Design a protein around this ligand. Structure first.
Ligand SMILES: NC(=[NH2+])N1CCCCC1
Ligand SMILES: [Ca+2]
Length: 223
């Protein structure tokens, strides 16, 4: 997250870290046994880390649970990043509390102008590299589809939305991939792609979760 603020320990209780020896992506807990993330975060041997703030220090509220199965969207395209969503089932159910909690799925898509919360442990600089150890947060609005398509001509599908600031300076960044965009208490987005980080006229692009609720619900119900 570039241009954000320190969230505060366990103030984003649905935020997860995906760990393969090191943090490599974010995700969101959507019930006691399932996490949603970006398909471009797919790899084997994932451990899901819940209840994290400082990812390098054991602070006492963590739950570390191995994945038992991962399911990349059937129509994910790695070249265009269309349908950039995956589901991860935990080997055992998480213990839900005030600091580890699920985030609701949307019943309706969010409109442009809605303010959302984006969070992650990704790079905090637009030029250079500095990775924080504690969770960072950013409040950002959903942009109009017209502004989104004008920023990325020929690249924005119906399954994507832009959020952030056309002026630049505030955005998600590398290592935030997979993480949540929460608006009015519902998961509306997944951190997906962009051109660099926090550049003028290049906002972040997010997977539009409301399009996938049916697939999520049916997949969970049979796996
Ligand atoms: N919002 C961005 N600029 N992103 C998404 C996360 C990866 C780097 C590009
Ligand atoms: Ca920790």
């Amino acid at each position: 997250i570039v241009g954000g603020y320190t969230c505060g320990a366990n103030t984003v209780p649905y935020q997860v870290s995906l760990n393969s020896g090191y943090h490599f992506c974010g995700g969101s807990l959507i019930n006691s046994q399932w996490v949603v993330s970006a398909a471009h975060c797919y790899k084997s041997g994932i451990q899901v880390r819940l209840g994290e703030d400082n990812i390098n220090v054991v602070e006492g509220n963590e739950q570390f649970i191995s994945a038992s199965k991962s399911i990349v969207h059937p129509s994910y395209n790695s070249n265009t990043l269309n349908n950039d969503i995956m589901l991860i089932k935990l080997k055992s159910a998480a213990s839900l509390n005030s600091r580890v909690a699920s985030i609701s799925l949307p019943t309706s898509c969010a409109s442009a102008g809605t303010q959302c919360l984006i969070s992650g442990w990704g790079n905090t600089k637009s030029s250079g590299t500095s990775y924080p150890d504690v969770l960072k947060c950013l409040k950002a609005p959903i942009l109009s589809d017209s502004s989104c398509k004008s920023a990325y001509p020929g690249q924005i599908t119906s399954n994507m939305f832009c959020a952030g600031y056309l002026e630049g300076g505030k955005d998600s960044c590398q290592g935030d991939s997979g993480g949540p965009v929460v608006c009015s208490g519902k998961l509306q987005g997944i951190v997906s792609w962009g051109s660099g980080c926090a550049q003028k006229n290049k906002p972040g692009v997010y997977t539009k979760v409301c399009n996938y609720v049916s697939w999520i619900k049916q997949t969970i119900a049979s796996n």
